[PDB]
Amino acid sequence: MNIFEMLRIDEGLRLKIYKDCEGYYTIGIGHLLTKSPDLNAAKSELDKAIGRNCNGVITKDEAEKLFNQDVDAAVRGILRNAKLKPVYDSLDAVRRCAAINEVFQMGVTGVAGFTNVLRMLQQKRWDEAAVNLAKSRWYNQCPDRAKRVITTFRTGTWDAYK
């Protein structure tokens, strides 16, 4: 069990544009195209990400390339954020996966705004963080995509994915 298998399970796989639990336009393994309300703007974003006229549909290899790019962006996003990085570096191995997963889903900006959760995580207050994350818009809006992540922050094990 690793970050890639963990996100695969949480985000699954869709080969045609859809609206995720936040209501935004998306394809592959949780690849967000745009926050614009316009399907056609998302449609361009897709051809642009892939390098061909798609059309709203992609292959498995292409989804996995996108997936790898998106994991990579999520880790880079953490390390370049002055708020996330020191909290990330205090975390043990398994919790770091939960942290990458949380950013992959929520984006850097969303995660970094949960100021107190970040402090609870840094002080290793696992129970409180998980309670305060279980209140978030993310959890209520995206409960099945979030549940295993939140449980993982509490326990620091992989049991939620087994």
Ligand SMILES: [Ca+2]
């Ligand atoms: Ca690391």
Ligand SMILES: [Cl-]
């Ligand atoms: Cl969900």
